[PDB]
Design a protein around this nucleic acid. Structure first.
Ligand code: AGS
Ligand code: AGS
Ligand code: MG
Ligand code: MG
Lengths: 455, 94, 450
DNA sequence: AAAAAAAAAAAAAAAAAAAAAAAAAA
DNA sequence: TTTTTTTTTTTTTTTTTTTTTTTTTT
């Protein structure tokens, strides 16, 4: 209707995939299956590289505790820890190389394509020798083969020459401007995409306050104005901070109003609350102000402000000048029949193995559905989400609730599992993508369910 | 690795047999009248239903059931004594 | 046929299980199954409490990074974080309570039992108000009901008096003496049971040498003899050499018995240890040669020895006198048909989701087989091992190979699964234990087949 | 094509709190 | 015989320093 959805994704000399490959994705949810160690996570990494400013590769393997891969390894395509010898036999492509990836989104009578080109020039491995160029396309005649053709008969100048004569093409040599243009195009909050990357492999909740203070909410600190006033040689700072707190509370009210419709465990749902706490240096500063009002000693306020500004990474400064650090967050469970608390939780400590997964998935999708366009009203302009190693620890019953909630929130999803589960996916999806490895090469096959059934 | 097990069909068949018989049924007769495709994964579901609906599960006496898989052979199961009936679990969601 | 194998385990007022409960375990291995949030982890925590001096509870849920629950929470039976108010509806037993555990081993006729009784007195909840008493016996006519009746008749005075009024029982009010006696009974190494506790929830490997220096190998450093020699105002090096030769001799046999299993379609593993030389030894040799060629230069040698004995927590001096630190460990993959090295590795960094699990399982089971029999006399006296959330991130073939590896070394194992992978289990297992929970109370049922 | 300023992630260390075991007094 | 006092060990939390990569200017 008015929401873009992923439809296809292509590769060239990326990771273990050599040559040219592609896969098609149905607009009613698909699943990715294949044996252990075949290439399922590589496609996800290739997609994530195009969106966030600093990806976390291979996140789901450790459960959300550590990332263990780098871009150059994918570009040159290593296949293990090697052996140690004269010839580095464990590296696939050595010397001069070239690599290109691209993903395409689609809507009702529209099309947008993203892309990237990366290439070496000599025998080196430093991260500063990997020349890069990002792209954004609107016209239908642009295609990956066209970009490779242009590069092979020129260079950076040849690629940049496309904008002069063509249409609907914008190459950006710096990733920062690329991401700024992207966010402006989709009308999306500043930290939505990093949240999307984080939601792929996170399976715990140490504390929800960190999640709300780092990802969901924006950043409107007041350090600069404080420094300006300090160097001018004041209550307006406090008025500004109070106004920011009020706006934060209104936004949180909006979110918890939205979260009601979806259903938790039967007869129950969730509500989010926040309390106000004042402590630390606020009392000291107020005392100093009231003491100076008696009369000199004007340098006391300047000293306090400068000390707070200098130590910008301490709890005193954060609690003094950052409005989003003047609240405390916790989640609660409400029974539908009437209204009464059943349990209030501030984290996920002490739970069972399967309860942590459902809690984390529910809260993450609830926050993400709001971080997208409906933050500023209207329906989302970018609806899709990726899950990795889905349903690793839960039982049969919990997966149904997860899928039902995901459908109710209004998002399209792709699931990535080994052959562990084959019934629910057949019941709720429409298309499948099969991967396979033979030696050191991997390939993709796309089929619907009926064709595989006929075998 | 398709098919596997179908829970809904097994539940429906068990309910139909129970409402048809109209008398308490132990595990041995239920297995004999409706042999399972897999020897396991079936007794577990029945025991889960028995414990959930609240039927007592006696454990001081034993019942013996003999089965043969697809590739011949024999298996002897030392199941406990459970009495299922339609009335107890007629109005519980699943 | 001289190995003790787990056969039974009993509970009373533990966790969510209220009143008496029981479970049986087959000599060929079993498999506990049940829905999510049923009580499977509680049953194995009850066993882990009796063995390690400092348990890690609920280890598998977080993947092997943290722990969440504590002992006093189990005894009072907390179910969830609750809410505000004062009734504390989320706590089951309030006021005076009493709890009991047991476990049984059988090898051939001979039988042993392990025990514990814990209780409160009032409405306090501090960890210092929880009385404790540990038991160990090898005679019949001593069951859980007997201990509970004796405790009700009197108090700890009545309990601790059973030793004089009987035969074959030994009460220990201090856990350290209890564990020392237990370790002496089975002739296992010093940290075998801690390794067993760790192996139940570890699905990731970071460095082999950490494990081989912290848990598997015992401590035989020569700090005392060196300090004595320094204060006397060299056989030390020969002693160190002998101790580093013994390790190589054991590793040879371990590799020989690991050779028979296929880590992959045509490949098998092997452990490799290499020798390193630090600068500290060079200085000592130089001092020795200088003293020999001098003929007073004795001050420097004694100063070096005294410095070594002083800061015994720096790798500079620790690597001089601790034979465990003179070696370096790593694994390698070798294929048959013209034995040829193909890959060497020192940790599971950068691997796939399923490769880490199998690597960790192989290394840990090899380490356990080493620890449970320190010398070449063979005949382990303890032969069980448990796994939690078995085969959670792998495919069919990987699970098959893991099970084959476990069966090769000669270990009796039990598996825990959230009602999954039944077809694979049914071939290699001949029992089951089903746990179901309604409302707030849990229950156990038992099966078998042949 | 080369030199400078800024930002994000990893590693080591100091401070603090809680629990277990042995010695001493009523 | 029962209670109290002391020491020792283990774990957690916060702060500072270091390194690498990206972007900008000449
Ligand atoms: N940077 C890298 N370093 C080492 N090995 C790599 C790297 N990138 C890919 N591989 C190899 O690629 C294979 C795993 O990649 P993938 O197939 O994407 O992982 P996977 O599909 O997630 O496997 P599962 O299903 O999660 S167990 C293994 O053979 C790895 O050795
Ligand atoms: N200390 C505790 N704090 C909070 N809840 C607890 C605690 N001990 C037990 N419970 C509850 O008791 C239930 C018993 O489940 P567990 O045995 O801990 O996990 P489980 O049965 O293994 O579930 P999984 O998904 O199979 S790991 C838990 O789900 C909690 O709801
Ligand atoms: Mg993966
Ligand atoms: Mg568990």
């Amino acid at each position: 209707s008015e929401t873009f959805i992923l439809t296809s994704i292509e590769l060239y000399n990326w990771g273990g995939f050599q040559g040219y490959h592609r896969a098609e994705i149905d607009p009613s949810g698909t699943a990715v299956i294949g044996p252990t160690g075949s290439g399922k996570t590589t496609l996800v990494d290739a997609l994530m590289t195009l969106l966030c400013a600093n990806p976390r590769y291979n996140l789901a393997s450790t459960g959300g505790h550590e990332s263990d891969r780098d871009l150059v390894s994918y570009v040159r395509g290593v296949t293990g820890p090697g052996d140690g010898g004269v010839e580095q036999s464990h590296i696939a492509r050595q010397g001069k190389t070239v690599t290109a990836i691209a993903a395409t989104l689609e809507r009702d009578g529209a099309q947008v394509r993203l892309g990237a080109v990366l290439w070496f020039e000599g025998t080196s491995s430093s991260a500063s020798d990997l020349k890069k160029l990002w792209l954004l396309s609107e016209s239908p005649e642009q295609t990956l083969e066209h970009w490779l053709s242009q590069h092979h008969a020129g260079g950076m100048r040849a690629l940049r020459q496309m904008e002069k004569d063509g249409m609907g093409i914008w190459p950006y040599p710096s990733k920062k401007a690329f991401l700024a243009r992207l966010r402006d195009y989709f009308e999306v909050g500043e930290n939505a995409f990093t949240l999307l990357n984080r939601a792929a492999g996170l399976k715990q909740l140490n504390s929800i306050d960190e999640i709300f203070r780092e990802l969901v909410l924006d950043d409107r600190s007041a350090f600069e104005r404080a420094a300006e006033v300090a160097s001018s040689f004041v209550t307006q700072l406090l008025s500004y901070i109070d106004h920011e707190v009020s706006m934060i509370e209104e936004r949180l009210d909006d979110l918890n109003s939205t979260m009601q419709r979806v259903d938790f465990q039967p007869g129950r749902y969730l509500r989010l609350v926040a309390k106000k706490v004042i402590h630390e240096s606020l009392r000291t500063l107020q005392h100093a102000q009231r003491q100076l009002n008696s009369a000199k000693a004007l340098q006391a306020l300047v000293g306090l402000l400068k000390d707070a500004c200098e130590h910008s990474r301490n709890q005193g400064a954060k609690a003094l000048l950052d409005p989003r650090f003047r609240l405390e967050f916790a989640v609660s469970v409400i029974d539908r029949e009437g209204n009464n608390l059943i349990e209030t939780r501030t984290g996920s400590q002490g739970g069972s193995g399967g309860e942590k997964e459902i809690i984390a998935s529910y809260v993450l999708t609830a926050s993400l559905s709001y971080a997208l366009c409906p933050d500023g009203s209207s329906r989302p302009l970018f609806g899709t989400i990726v899950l990795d190693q889905a349903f690793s620890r839960s039982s049969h019953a919990v997966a149904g609730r997860i899928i039902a909630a995901l459908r109710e929130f209004g998002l399209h999803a792709v699931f990535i599992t080994p052959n562990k589960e084959m019934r629910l996916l057949r019941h709720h999806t429409r298309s499948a993508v099969v991967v396979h490895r033979r030696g050191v090469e991997s390939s993709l096959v796309s089929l619907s369910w009926e064709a595989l059934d006929e075998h | 690795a398709f098919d596997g097990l179908d829970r809904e069909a097994l539940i429906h068949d068990t309910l139909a047999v129970l409402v048809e018989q109209g008398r308490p049924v132990s595990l041995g007769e239920l297995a004999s009248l409706l042999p399972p495709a897999h020897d396991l994964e079936t007794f577990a579901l029945w025991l889960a239903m028995a414990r959930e609906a609240g039927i007592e599960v006696l454990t001081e006496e034993r019942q013996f059931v003999e089965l043969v898989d697809e590739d011949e052979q024999r298996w002897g199961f030392n199941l406990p004594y459970v009495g299922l009936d339609h009335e107890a679990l007629k109005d519980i969601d699943w």
